[PDB]
């Protein structure tokens, strides 16, 4: 309960913000062009929050947060006073109406710029792309890549952190090989290696592209030391205190923490003989894991948070700039994201990216919950990414979207007159049908 509520709240706030910024771009550019905005609907369905401005503009918050619109003044929808005729949308030039229509996606892009600028002003952390472990017989193992190597670039594009590395790796789906400029950590002697991607197969929704290459990044190391023990837990009833060191679990010494994790998760109820050390004194204990609700089966909990040692700050990057520099870098980052979304849609259409791994609203909500839990410096880039996505999928040439408006408007500009009398209407309805079908298919592949 306490988790799903946070997820839904973060999802609703993210939606609200993005809808508001798109419709605000629409409304601002429209009002500046000289037309009169009537309704500023943020959401679909029955309205809940209606307010009226002095200029007659009605701001409306509805209940279905999966969209929104801006109702313009048009002679093709209501009878207009002879003086308000030039305040109508249809009585404007093709260029003005095209700008008013394109304002929305441009508003989303500008919101992404602003989010990344605010993040750069406040600063976003990051880890250097340094390999810690290499899985044998993998993509990177066969390319003469040794542990302790700092990735410098992917196909020439700079990769200062693991995030940019994954961002460039996902852009190589469908390719048979890729080129990575690497260097040992410390020495700036660059070297171009080539990863073979012919038999490469991974789901971007389920698999980390770094691990898909058999690469583990160097991160904070978990050590078999108890940081704190929650009260009224299995470890608390087992006699474990803060600062204890798990040495032996069921006869064999404890080498990794994932071993203890799997032993607690796959063995609920059954005892575990723990030989530990407390203040240099060896002790024996019997840990009986509980059985809290899990996914797929019954998982076991003990209430132990291990002690993690963060990797040295040598593998840390601070990405904060000054105001003007932050503006420049945010523009560059959002342009990169736009080009990457273009290439990703191209990959999905060309036939090498399955549509079943698409971002579904429940997955979007879980990601929003996780990000909002992580803080603001993570929630803002998430909002910027989803804003770029929304702005770029609405500029898609389809009758009901802003892009279809721009398309029919350009055809009117060339032809000298609106495309269709009612020949459009049968596409106006079919586009809404296709949008509802796409929404349903996206919701179903998420489930
Ligand atoms: C989550 N909904 C969307 O992303 C749809 C397009 C879509 C539908 C289904 C699947 C994928 C994309 N876009 C919009 O709702 C735009 C609103 C922005 C702020 C998101 C909106 C589209 S117009 C209208 C459609 C129905 C009544 S009014 C717009 O352009 N206002 O200026
Ligand atoms: Zn006037
Ligand atoms: Zn729009």
Q: Is the CB of 102 under 6 A from ligand 1?
A: no
Element (H, E) at 262: helix 257-266
Q: Do 159 and 168 form a contact (C-beta atoms < 8 A)?
A: yes
Q: Is the CB of 59 under 6 A from ligand 1?
A: no
CA of 391 to the centre of ligand 1 (A): 9
3-class DSSP assignment, residue 355: helix
If you classify domain 221-309 with CATH, what class do you get?
mainly beta
23 is catalytic: yes
User: Residue 101: nearest ligand to its CA?
Assistant: 3
Reported structure resolution in angstroms = 3.2
Neighbours of 237 (CB within 10 A): 15
- Mutate which of 65, 68, 102, 112 for ligand 1 pocket (most atoms within 8 A of beta carbon): 68
Instruction: Name the CA radius of gyration of the chain, rounded.
Output: 28
CA of 43 to the centre of ligand 1 (A): 10
In the DSSP assignment, the letter for residue 87 is G
CA separation, residue 235 to residues 9, 28, 127, 255 (Å): 33, 59, 33, 20
As annotated, the binding site for Zn(2+) includes 22, 26
CA of 146 to the centre of ligand 1 (A): 48
Name the CA dihedral angle for 307, 312, 315, 318, rounded to a multiple of 10 degrees: 90
Atom of ligand 1 nearest to the CA of 435: 9
Superfamily the domain 126-219+311-317 falls into: PDZ domain (2.30.42.10)
Q: Left if phi > 0, otherwise alpha if psi is -120 to 50, otherwise beta: which for 83?
A: alpha
Q: If you search the block for the tokens 């197969």, which residue do you land on? A: 201
Q: Is the CB of 404 under 6 A from ligand 1?
A: no
Q: Is the CB of 62 under 6 A from ligand 1?
A: no
Which strands form 177-184's sheet, in the order they lie side by side? 157-158, 149-154, 177-184, 191-196
Q: Where are the domains of the chain?
A: 2-34+92-123+387-446, 126-219+311-317, 221-309
Q: Left if phi > 0, otherwise alpha if psi is -120 to 50, otherwise beta: which for 71?
A: beta
CA of 102 to the centre of ligand 1 (A): 13
Helices 323-350 & 94-122, crossing angle to 10 degrees? 120
Task: Tell me the HSE value of 301 on the side-chain side, using a 13 A CA sphere.
Answer: 11
Residues with Cβ within 8 Å of residue 173, at least 6 apart in sequence: 204, 347, 352, 353
Task: Quote the tokens at residue 126.
Answer: 């990051």
- Method by which the model was determined: X-ray
Q: Is 192 exposed, middle or buried (0-12, 13-18, 19+ CB in 10 A)?
A: exposed
Q: How many residues does the chain have?
A: 447
Report the C-alpha gap between 291 and 252 in whole angstroms. 24
Q: Is the CB of 390 under 6 A from ligand 1?
A: yes
Q: Left if phi > 0, otherwise alpha if psi is -120 to 50, otherwise beta: which for 130?
A: beta
Q: Is the CB of 66 under 6 A from ligand 1?
A: yes
Which residue has a Cα nearest atom 1 of ligand 1?
A: 66
Element (H, E) at 152: strand 149-154
Task: Tell me the HSE value of 107 on the side-chain side, using a 13 A CA sphere.
Answer: 22
Cross-strand bridge partners of residue 71: 39
Q: If you search the block for the tokens 């918050």, which residue do you land on? A: 61
CA of 82 to the centre of ligand 2 (A): 10
Residue 395: phi and psi, rounded to 5, are -80, 15
Report the C-alpha gap between 161 and 312 in whole angstroms. 15
Fold identical between 126-219+311-317 and 221-309?
yes
- Mutate which of 108, 394, 444 for ligand 1 pocket (most atoms within 8 A of beta carbon): 394
Task: Quote the tokens at residue 267.
Answer: 């063995």
């Amino acid at each position: 309960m306490l988790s799903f509520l946070w997820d839904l709240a973060s999802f609703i706030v993210a939606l609200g913000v993005l809808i508001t910024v798109h419709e605000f771009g629409h409304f601002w550019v429209a009002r500046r062009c000289g037309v009169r905005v009537e309704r500023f609907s943020i959401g679909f369905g029955k309205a809940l929050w209606r307010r009226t401005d002095k200029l007659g503009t009605e701001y409306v918050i509805a209940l279905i947060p999966l969209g929104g619109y801006v109702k313009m003044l048009d002679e093709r929808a209501e009878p207009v006073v002879p003086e308000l005729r030039h305040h109508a949308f249809n009585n404007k030039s093709v260029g003005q109406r095209a700008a008013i229509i394109a304002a929305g996606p441009v508003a989303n892009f500008i919101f992404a710029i602003f989010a990344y600028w605010l993040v750069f002003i406040i600063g976003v952390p990051g880890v250097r792309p340094v390999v810690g472990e290499i899985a044998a017989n993998s993509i990177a193992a066969e390319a003469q890549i040794a542990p302790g190597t700092e990735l410098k670039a992917v196909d020439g594009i700079e990769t200062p952190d693991w995030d940019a590395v994954r961002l460039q790796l996902v852009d190589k789906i469908g390719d048979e090989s890729t080129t990575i400029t690497v260097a040992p950590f410390g020495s700036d002697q660059r070297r171009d290696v080539k990863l073979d991607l012919r038999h490469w197969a991974f789901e971007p929704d389920k698999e980390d592209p770094v691990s898909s290459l058999g690469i583990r990044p160097r991160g904070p190391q978990i050590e078999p030391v108890l940081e704190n023990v929650q009260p009224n837990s299995a470890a608390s009833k087992a006699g474990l205190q803060a600062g204890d060191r798990i040495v032996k679990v069921d006869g064999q010494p404890l080498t990794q923490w994932v071993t203890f994790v799997m032993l607690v998760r796959d063995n609920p109820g059954k005892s575990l003989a723990l030989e530990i050390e407390r203040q240099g004194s060896p002790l024996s204990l019997t840990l009986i894991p509980e059985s809290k609700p899990g996914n797929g089966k019954a998982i076991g909990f003990v209430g132990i948070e291990p002690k993690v040692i963060p990797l040295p700050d040598e593998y840390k990057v601070v990405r904060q700039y000054g105001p003007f520099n932050a503006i420049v870098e945010a523009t560059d980052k959002t342009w990169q994201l736009m080009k990457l979304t273009v290439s990703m849609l191209g990959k999905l259409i060309t036939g090498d990216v399955k549509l079943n791994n698409l971002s579904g609203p429940i997955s979007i909500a879980k990601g929003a919950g996780m990000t909002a839990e992580l803080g603001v410096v993570y929630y803002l880039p998430f909002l910027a990414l989803i804003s770029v996505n929304l702005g770029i999928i609405n500029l898609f040439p389809l009758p009901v979207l802003d892009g279809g408006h721009l398309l029919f408007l350009a055809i009117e500009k060339i032809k000298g007159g609106p495309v269709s009398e009612r020949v459009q209407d049968f596409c106006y309805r079919i586009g809404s049908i296709l949008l509802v079908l796409l929404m349903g298919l996206a919701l179903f592949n998420d489930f």
